[PDB]
Design an enzyme around this catalytic site. Structure first.
Site, mmCIF file in Angstrom:
data_model
loop_
_atom_site.group_PDB
_atom_site.id
_atom_site.type_symbol
_atom_site.label_atom_id
_atom_site.label_comp_id
_atom_site.label_asym_id
_atom_site.label_seq_id
_atom_site.Cartn_x
_atom_site.Cartn_y
_atom_site.Cartn_z
ATOM 1 N N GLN A 133 -7.010 -2.311 -3.940
ATOM 2 C CA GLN A 133 -5.798 -1.595 -4.040
ATOM 3 C C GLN A 133 -6.025 -0.708 -5.389
ATOM 4 O O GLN A 133 -5.335 0.556 -5.380
ATOM 5 C CB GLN A 133 -4.887 -2.372 -4.244
ATOM 6 N N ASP A 155 -7.880 2.531 -4.338
ATOM 7 C CA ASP A 155 -7.294 3.077 -3.392
ATOM 8 C C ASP A 155 -6.421 3.912 -4.256
ATOM 9 O O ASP A 155 -6.318 5.354 -4.063
ATOM 10 C CB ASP A 155 -6.585 2.128 -2.575
ATOM 11 N N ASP A 203 -6.622 4.844 -7.278
ATOM 12 C CA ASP A 203 -7.508 5.909 -8.180
ATOM 13 C C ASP A 203 -7.593 7.129 -7.188
ATOM 14 O O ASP A 203 -7.862 8.421 -7.733
ATOM 15 C CB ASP A 203 -8.684 5.362 -8.713
ATOM 16 N N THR A 238 -6.268 12.345 -8.386
ATOM 17 C CA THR A 238 -7.640 13.072 -8.256
ATOM 18 C C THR A 238 -8.502 12.579 -7.302
ATOM 19 O O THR A 238 -8.457 11.240 -7.307
ATOM 20 C CB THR A 238 -8.156 13.007 -9.590
ATOM 21 N N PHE A 249 -11.545 12.288 -7.251
ATOM 22 C CA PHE A 249 -12.583 11.511 -8.169
ATOM 23 C C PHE A 249 -12.396 10.062 -8.455
ATOM 24 O O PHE A 249 -11.062 9.839 -8.769
ATOM 25 C CB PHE A 249 -13.006 12.369 -9.535
ATOM 26 N N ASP A 252 -12.243 8.137 -11.254
ATOM 27 C CA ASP A 252 -12.321 8.801 -12.787
ATOM 28 C C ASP A 252 -11.278 8.057 -13.385
ATOM 29 O O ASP A 252 -10.936 8.453 -14.383
ATOM 30 C CB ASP A 252 -12.152 10.126 -12.618
ATOM 31 N N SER A 270 -8.051 7.976 -12.938
ATOM 32 C CA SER A 270 -6.751 8.555 -12.988
ATOM 33 C C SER A 270 -5.673 7.749 -12.847
ATOM 34 O O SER A 270 -4.582 7.820 -13.168
ATOM 35 C CB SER A 270 -6.759 9.668 -11.900
ATOM 36 N N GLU A 304 4.063 -2.287 -8.091
ATOM 37 C CA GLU A 304 4.236 -2.854 -6.740
ATOM 38 C C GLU A 304 4.160 -4.232 -6.446
ATOM 39 O O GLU A 304 4.853 -4.565 -5.555
ATOM 40 C CB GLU A 304 3.455 -1.908 -5.598
ATOM 41 N N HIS A 314 -4.925 -4.269 3.757
ATOM 42 C CA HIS A 314 -3.696 -4.990 3.988
ATOM 43 C C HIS A 314 -3.805 -6.198 4.816
ATOM 44 O O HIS A 314 -2.809 -7.243 4.851
ATOM 45 C CB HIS A 314 -2.711 -3.865 4.738
HETATM 46 C C1 HEM Z 1 0.010 -6.926 -1.922
HETATM 47 C C2 HEM Z 1 -0.701 -5.991 -1.886
HETATM 48 C C3 HEM Z 1 -0.207 -4.624 -1.376
HETATM 49 C C4 HEM Z 1 1.166 -3.890 -1.111
HETATM 50 C C5 HEM Z 1 2.264 -4.676 -1.560
HETATM 51 C C6 HEM Z 1 0.973 -2.802 -0.425
HETATM 52 C C7 HEM Z 1 1.709 -1.556 -0.190
HETATM 53 C C8 HEM Z 1 1.549 -0.637 0.206
HETATM 54 C C9 HEM Z 1 2.710 0.440 0.368
HETATM 55 C C10 HEM Z 1 4.217 0.202 0.595
HETATM 56 C C11 HEM Z 1 2.191 1.513 0.896
HETATM 57 C C12 HEM Z 1 2.712 2.928 1.317
HETATM 58 C C13 HEM Z 1 2.990 2.910 3.006
HETATM 59 C C14 HEM Z 1 3.540 4.156 3.308
HETATM 60 O O1 HEM Z 1 4.709 4.494 3.000
HETATM 61 O O2 HEM Z 1 2.851 4.878 4.186
HETATM 62 C C15 HEM Z 1 0.638 1.461 0.650
HETATM 63 C C16 HEM Z 1 -0.332 2.425 1.088
HETATM 64 C C17 HEM Z 1 -1.573 1.964 0.866
HETATM 65 N N1 HEM Z 1 -2.328 1.022 0.587
HETATM 66 FE FE1 HEM Z 1 -1.459 -0.803 0.340
HETATM 67 N N2 HEM Z 1 -0.619 -2.499 -0.445
HETATM 68 C C18 HEM Z 1 -1.146 -3.763 -0.997
HETATM 69 C C19 HEM Z 1 -2.670 -3.956 -0.850
HETATM 70 C C20 HEM Z 1 -3.339 -2.827 -0.697
HETATM 71 C C21 HEM Z 1 -4.874 -3.042 -0.800
HETATM 72 C C22 HEM Z 1 -5.790 -4.401 -0.823
HETATM 73 C C23 HEM Z 1 -5.563 -1.812 -0.368
HETATM 74 C C24 HEM Z 1 -6.895 -1.509 -0.084
HETATM 75 C C25 HEM Z 1 -7.928 -2.380 -0.334
HETATM 76 C C26 HEM Z 1 -4.435 -0.860 0.069
HETATM 77 C C27 HEM Z 1 -4.779 0.510 0.303
HETATM 78 C C28 HEM Z 1 -3.665 1.217 0.535
HETATM 79 C C29 HEM Z 1 -3.730 2.577 0.740
HETATM 80 C C30 HEM Z 1 -4.908 3.730 0.919
HETATM 81 C C31 HEM Z 1 -2.567 3.032 0.865
HETATM 82 C C32 HEM Z 1 -2.174 4.673 1.339
HETATM 83 C C33 HEM Z 1 -2.112 5.528 -0.114
HETATM 84 C C34 HEM Z 1 -2.069 7.027 -0.031
HETATM 85 O O3 HEM Z 1 -0.697 7.459 -0.070
HETATM 86 O O4 HEM Z 1 -2.711 7.936 0.133
HETATM 87 N N3 HEM Z 1 -3.191 -1.663 -0.354
HETATM 88 N N4 HEM Z 1 0.200 0.121 0.306
HETATM 89 CA CA CA Z 2 -8.858 9.547 -9.244
#
Ligand code: HEM
Ligand code: CA
Ligand SMILES: *[C@@H]1O[C@H](CO)[C@@H](O[C@@H]2O[C@H](CO)[C@@H](O[C@@H]3O[C@H](CO[C@H]4O[C@H](CO)[C@@H](O)[C@H](O[C@H]5O[C@H](CO)[C@@H](O)[C@H](O)[C@@H]5O)[C@@H]4O)[C@@H](O)[C@H](O[C@H]4O[C@H](CO)[C@@H](O)[C@H](O)[C@@H]4O)[C@@H]3O)[C@H](O)[C@H]2NC(C)=O)[C@H](O)[C@H]1NC(C)=O
Ligand SMILES: *[C@@H]1O[C@H](CO)[C@@H](O[C@@H]2O[C@H](CO)[C@@H](O)[C@H](O)[C@H]2NC(C)=O)[C@H](O)[C@H]1NC(C)=O
Ligand code: NAG
Ligand code: NAG
Ligand code: CA
Ligand code: CA
Ligand code: CA
Ligand code: CA
Length: 595
Positions: A105, A108, A110, A184, A186, A188, A190, A258, A351
């Site tokens: 997370q 992600d 960063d 960013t 990178f 990095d 951020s 969060e 997730h």
């Molecule tokens: C309890 C743990 C976590 C919670 C509560 C959580 C919650 C969220 C929420 C609410 C979103 C936005 C969803 C949307 O509106 O489309 C999100 C996006 C995301 N989550 Fe999770 N998440 C969790 C764990 C993780 C983990 C473990 C990873 C990766 C290993 C991850 C990767 C992502 C990514 C890449 C996004 C999209 C980010 C973007 O906007 O570019 N999350 N998450």
């Molecule tokens: Ca970054």
């Protein structure tokens, strides 16, 4: 005839030759194309956007508009029928600690954030979207299927607001809609320092020329820093407990509070910056506050890169690590470092690794108090449980000694996230992250499962039997086909995560390919990559090789005992050693200079 023109709002910085540190925005990393990987620009498109109207409307927007001759299924119906399960017994990963989930997370955050369109408050809009569930403009509500328990309990929909898009974020243009990456590209740090000049300045202690980050002035953790509070109202962290009234933390990334363990990992990183700045000041007394801040920032960025590429990605990608991410050969300024739109869905494999509970453990790795173990959903936007219930040490001990959830074709996403998610301004613990991920895939114009299989040189199953063979699972393939009718229509988030995990890894082939390609590009396309000659010195790179999450914990908590390999399943006391036994980061190579 190209037109790389568009990118309207513009953090337009000109680039200084031989500038010694990263910009905060990520501008000027690539000399030929200075906007490449900078924040607040369009996510890269590895394939063209796929929209119902070819431009901007998601598949599912118009009920009578099919995808390949079949109606797309309701996001929530896919969630209920495929993604949900009841029984948490046996779901834990026997060889990944909880830190494995939590580092994902962190990385992600960063790399990518595609925030919901502005539209602001003071507007009959997201209010109406929440109240009346009427689809229109940026309101793309998640409608409940007829048999959904939430239809009985929660009204007709989950509110959902479309992601922001570049040039206008109101009117629109004649190319396809392109969602924004607000951080960013990178790797990095951020998430610690910010991706915008204003936030990056607000995060710093500019009172003293010590190069420190601002720290909480209201509460301390046995003499160790908390992040500052975000004093913006309303505060979701105040909302979830109006008796405690503890605000959210302010960090480089908007999402830091969060869930309590993200806030915990953010706290470690902030402490590590200040520890580094203090040590560089002892070593280098004539270094000014700007120099101390940049040198600490550069070390913390190298720490995040090395933990990620050396310890994390090998146990994600397993056998596919050598296929997609060969040993580093140097900076390639022809590589596109931008995060792709699809990667922001591929990385949501995390997730399915989030377990249903969080534990606090005492100095003996025993239960912290009478409610040591808590349900995850009570810890969304929960900062009071840190300040008022033992600080971050009991939570860090739980990150080491407790396990990630294991992805399971029959048990994909815990109901803590699938039914009890809290979203800011929406009042209830009643949202569905899985349904949100599916709706967002369509929001962002994602090509379907088989387009990405093709992209990755993998077979494109056309029939039930073909999908059963790819998934190695008859019942899951039948449930997918009953809802989607062709594997061409399966949303990338669910199709990618439905695949069996590669040997020694935690994702299937399709995800290993999309994740591997992206991580290869952010490493190879980064001029400030830690191992790029002239970023650090030979002697500095030798010191940096000895970083570990275990040392990060020893240096920035009162925890006495840690495991050597923090991402694997570790049990106390057998797998835990004294901190004095763990390698240290030797900063003596950062001496200004010598003879
Ligand atoms: C309890 C743990 C976590 C919670 C509560 C959580 C919650 C969220 C929420 C609410 C979103 C936005 C969803 C949307 O509106 O489309 C999100 C996006 C995301 N989550 Fe999770 N998440 C969790 C764990 C993780 C983990 C473990 C990873 C990766 C290993 C991850 C990767 C992502 C990514 C890449 C996004 C999209 C980010 C973007 O906007 O570019 N999350 N998450
Ligand atoms: Ca970054
Ligand atoms: C940015 O970075 C700066 C410093 O680099 C931070 O400023 C310092 O913050 C801490 C609070 O977190 C202050 O510590 C307090 O110190 C007093 C003891 O005061 C004596 O020693 C101080 C440290 O050397 C010194 O600054 C003091 O001198 C000032 O004050 C006197 C008046 O008393 C004045 O005569 C001088 O001219 C200076 O102006 C003084 O010699 C200590 O008692 C405090 O403890 C109380 O409050 C805490 C709660 O924080 C509580 O836990 C205790 O039990 C008790 O109630 C506290 O520790 C330090 O004084 C600050 N330094 C300066 C120069 O202002 C700053 O916080 C950073 N900002 C951010 C946002 O990160
Ligand atoms: C909100 O936070 C408060 C603490 O500020 C929690 O109240 C504490 O919890 C239990 C009560 O059952 C006791 O250990 C303390 O005596 C309580 N303190 C106070 C001030 O009431 C409370 O449980 C939290 N509530 C929710 C809904 O999370
Ligand atoms: C746990 O995983 C690591 C690689 O991440 C490996 O070294 C070790 O053999 C694994 N242990 C078990 C019990 O499989
Ligand atoms: C540099 O990048 C381009 C685009 O990925 C690639 O074609 C070329 O082979 C790379 N150079 C290397 C690997 O040295
Ligand atoms: Ca760009
Ligand atoms: Ca500290
Ligand atoms: Ca709680
Ligand atoms: Ca099954």
């Amino acid at each position: 005839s190209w037109e790389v023109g568009c990118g309207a709002p513009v953090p337009l910085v000109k680039c200084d030759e031989n500038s010694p540190y990263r910009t905060i925005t990520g501008d000027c990393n690539n000399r030929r194309s200075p906007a490449l990987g900078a924040a607040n620009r369009a996510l890269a498109r590895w394939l063209p956007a796929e929209y119902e109207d070819g431009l901007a409307l998601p598949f599912g927007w118009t009920q009578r508009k099919t995808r390949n001759g079949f109606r797309v299924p309701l996001a929530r119906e896919v969630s209920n029928k495929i993604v949900g399960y009841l029984d948490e017994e046996g779901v834990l990963d026997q060889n990944r600690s909880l830190l494995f989930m939590q580092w994902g997370q962190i990385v992600d955050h960063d790399l990518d954030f595609a925030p919901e369109t502005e539209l602001g408050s003071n507007e009959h809009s997201k209010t109406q979207c929440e109240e009346y569930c009427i689809q229109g403009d940026n309101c793309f509500p998640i409608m409940f299927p007829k048999n959904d328990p939430k239809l009985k309990t929660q009204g007709k929909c989950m509110p959902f607001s479309r992601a922001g898009f570049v040039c206008p974020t109101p009117p629109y243009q004649s190319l396809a809609r392109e969602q924004i990456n607000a951080v960013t590209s990178f790797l990095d740090a951020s998430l610690v320092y910010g991706s915008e000049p204003s936030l990056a300045s607000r995060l710093r202690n500019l009172s003293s020329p010590l190069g420190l980050m601002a720290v909480n002035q209201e509460a301390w953790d046995h003499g160790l820093a908390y992040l500052p509070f975000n004093n913006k109202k309303p505060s979701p962290c105040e909302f979830i407990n109006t008796t405690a009234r503890v605000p959210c933390f302010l960090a480089g990334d908007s999402r830091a509070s969060e869930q309590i363990l993200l806030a915990t990992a953010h706290t470690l990183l902030l402490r590590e910056h200040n520890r580094l700045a203090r040590e560089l000041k002892k070593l280098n007394p004539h270094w000014n506050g700007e120099k101390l801040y940049q040198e600490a920032r550069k070390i913390l960025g190298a720490f995040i890169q090395i933990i990620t590429f050396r310890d994390y990605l090998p146990i994600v990608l397993g056998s596919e690590m050598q296929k997609w991410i060969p040993p580093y050969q140097g900076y390639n300024n022809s590589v596109d470092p931008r995060i792709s739109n699809v990667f922001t869905f591929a990385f949501r494999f995390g997730h399915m690794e989030v377990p249903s509970t969080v534990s606090r453990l005492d100095e003996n790795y025993q239960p912290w108090g009478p409610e040591a173990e808590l349900p995850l959903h009570t810890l969304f936007f929960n900062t009071w449980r840190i300040i008022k219930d033992g600080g971050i040490d009991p939570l860090v001990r739980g990150l080491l000694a407790k396990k990630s959830k294991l992805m399971n074709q029959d048990k994909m996403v815990t109901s803590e996230l699938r039914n009890k998610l809290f979203q800011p301004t929406h009042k209830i613990h009643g949202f569905d992250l899985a349904a949100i991920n599916l709706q967002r895939c369509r929001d962002h114009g994602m090509p379907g499962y088989n387009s990405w299989r093709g992209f990755c040189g993998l077979s494109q199953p056309k029939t039930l039997k073909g999908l059963q063979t790819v998934l190695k699972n008859k019942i899951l393939a039948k449930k997918l086909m009953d809802l989607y009718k062709t594997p061409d229509n399966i949303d990338i988030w669910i199709g990618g995560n439905a695949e069996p995990m590669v040997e020694r890894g935690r994702v299937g082939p399709l995800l290993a390919c999309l994740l591997g390609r992206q991580f290869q590009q952010i490493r190879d396309g980064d001029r400030f990559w830690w191992e790029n000659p002239g970023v650090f010195t030979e002697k500095q790179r030798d010191s940096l090789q000895k970083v570990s999450f275990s040392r990060l914990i020893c240096d920035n908590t009162h925890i006495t005992k840690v495991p050597l390999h923090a991402f694997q399943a570790n049990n106390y006391p057998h797998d835990f050693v004294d901190c004095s036994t763990v390698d240290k980061l030797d900063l003596s190579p950062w001496a200004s200079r010598e003879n």
